[PDB]
Amino acid sequence: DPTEQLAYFPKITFERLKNGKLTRNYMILLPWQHVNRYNFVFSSTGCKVSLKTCIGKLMKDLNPKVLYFIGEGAGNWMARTACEYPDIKFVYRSLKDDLDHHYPLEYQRVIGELSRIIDSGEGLSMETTDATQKTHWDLIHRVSKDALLITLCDAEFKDRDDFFKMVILWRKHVLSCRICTTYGTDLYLFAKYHAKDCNVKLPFFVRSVATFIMQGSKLSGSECYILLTLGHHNNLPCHGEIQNSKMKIAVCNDFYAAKKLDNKSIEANCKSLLSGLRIPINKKELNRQRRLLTKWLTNKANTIIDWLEHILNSPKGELNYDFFEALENTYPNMIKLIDNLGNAEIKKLIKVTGYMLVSKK
Ligand SMILES: Nc1nc2c(ncn2[C@@H]2O[C@H](COP(=O)(O)OP(=O)(O)OP(=O)(O)O)[C@@H](O)[C@H]2O)c(=O)[nH]1
Ligand SMILES: C[S@@+](CC[C@H](N)C(=O)[O-])C[C@H]1O[C@@H](n2cnc3c(N)ncnc32)[C@H](O)[C@@H]1O
Ligand SMILES: Nc1ncnc2c1ncn2[C@@H]1O[C@H](CO)[C@@H](O)[C@H]1O
Ligand SMILES: [Zn+2]
Numbered sequence: 001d002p003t004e005q006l007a008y009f010p011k012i013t014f015e016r017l018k019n020g021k022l023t024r025n026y027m028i029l030l031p032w033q034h035v036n037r038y039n040f041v042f043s044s045t046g047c048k049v050s051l052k053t054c055i056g057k058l059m060k061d062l063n064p065k066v067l068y069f070i071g072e073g074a075g076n077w078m079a080r081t082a083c084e085y086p087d088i089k090f091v092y093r094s095l096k097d098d099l100d101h102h103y104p105l106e107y108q109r110v111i112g113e114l115s116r117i118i119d120s121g122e123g124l125s126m127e128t129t130d131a132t133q134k135t136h137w138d139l140i141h142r143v144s145k146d147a148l149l150i151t152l153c154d155a156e157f158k159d160r161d162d163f164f165k166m167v168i169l170w171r172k173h174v175l176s177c178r179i180c181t182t183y184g185t186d187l188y189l190f191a192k193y194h195a196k197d198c199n200v201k202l203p204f205f206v207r208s209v210a211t212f213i214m215q216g217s218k219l220s221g222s223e224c225y226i227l228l229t230l231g232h233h234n235n236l237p238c239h240g241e242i243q244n245s246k247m248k249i250a251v252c253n254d255f256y257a258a259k260k261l262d263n264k265s266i267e268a269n270c271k272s273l274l275s276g277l278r279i280p281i282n283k284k285e286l287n288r289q290r291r292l293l294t295k296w297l298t299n300k301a302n303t304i305i306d307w308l309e310h311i312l313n314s315p316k317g318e319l320n321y322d323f324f325e326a327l328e329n330t331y332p333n334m335i336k337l338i339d340n341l342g343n344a345e346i347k348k349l350i351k352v353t354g355y356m357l358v359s360k361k
Pocket of ligand 1: 043048217218
């Protein structure tokens with residue numbers, strides 16, 4: 001039942017900016033945005049962004065039967081959407097390159113099966129899975145004959161110019177396509193954007209309706225989600241506007257823990273971080289992991305156990321950046337930890353840390 005899987009997803013905090021300076025330098029080196037993402041394995045974007053939370057009214061008003069997810073990788077965002085809207089069908093696209101997922105592995109794990117994905121991009125070439133290519137847009141209706149009422153794009157492009165290439169092709173499709181033109185101009189593209197320079201105009205006849213600043217976005221970044229439509233063009237958000245909104249959330253809000261614990265998922269993340277790690281993670285479990293060690297792999301294992309021991313011995317606090325800064329700055333081996341563990345391992349470490357923090361008291 002998709003509605004029961006929704007309790008594994010944490011509540012989202014965000015700010016909507018419809019179309020003084022606040023600063024706080026958090027002395028953090030870890031990707032703490034994954035703190036409440038312990039229930040998800042291959043991807044976890046759904047813990048950060050949600051269609052019901054951000055564009056609930058638009059979802060209700062347009063009432064799409066089919067949603068188009070492009071640059072959707074393992075499909076966790078699509079999976080949360082499938083839990084929020086149990087009757088909606090999906091068209092999935094993601095760049096086929098073998099660097100990331102081009103099959104919705106996380107959607108499959110969360111939902112159980114792919115019956116609601118009517119088009120998963122089976123038999124498509126690298127070119128026809130690429131959102132910056134015209135052929136990708138020309139083949140978007142090979143299964144679904146429903147107009148692109150709402151298109152979702154979470155693609156992380158190799159170059160900044162690729163975002164514009166994608167937006168131009170979305171506009172060229174919705175203004176040419178027999179299916180989409182028949183529906184009209186009330187069509188939307190909800191896309192991930194990294195805010196940089198100001199006075200950067202959107203392509204001709206592409207208009208931003210709102211800018212969404214998510215609590216779950218990387219603190220050092222400038223990521224945001226823009227709701228785009230057809231109409232007289234305006235400017236993209238710049239780094240400055242996004243910083244104030246993002247700093248307020250970081251300073252004032254706590255991360256919500258998921259209502260329910262997904263034990264199979266938590267165990268899958270624990271074993272992925274340290275092979276053989278069991279739940280509950282206590283003094284007994286960490287001493288057992290230490291005893292198994294008695295090399296490069298043992299050095300990495302010791303670094304992990306030392307951090308989990310520090311979390312175990314740490315006092316309980318609220319899930320916020322002030323507490324995260326305290327956790328890092330009370331740990332004497334911080335620089336050795338970031339030096340020893342890679343980006344993927346550190347991300348797994350934060351999910352497991354988050355599970356431990358939520359489990360306290
Ligand atoms: N490798 C990996 N990436 C994930 C996983 N779950 C989510 N992500 C990524 O994490 C992102 C969360 O947004 P951010 O905080 O903006 O990004 P980031 O580039 O992942 O972050 P940092 O780890 O802080 O460098 C998602 O959009 C995904 O790209 C996961 O299990 N593994
Ligand atoms: C942030 S991940 C998407 C995560 C997804 N929302 C989830 O919940 O699993 C970004 C994805 O964009 C893909 N991508 C990168 N460039 C792309 C392009 N040109 N066209 C389509 N997808 C692209 C990457 O392969 C990657 O899977
Ligand atoms: N969705 C996007 N919106 C804006 N810029 C992007 C996007 N994806 C990647 N980039 C930019 O591409 C650059 C090179 O990978 C990065 O510095 C990043 O800012
Ligand atoms: Zn169309």
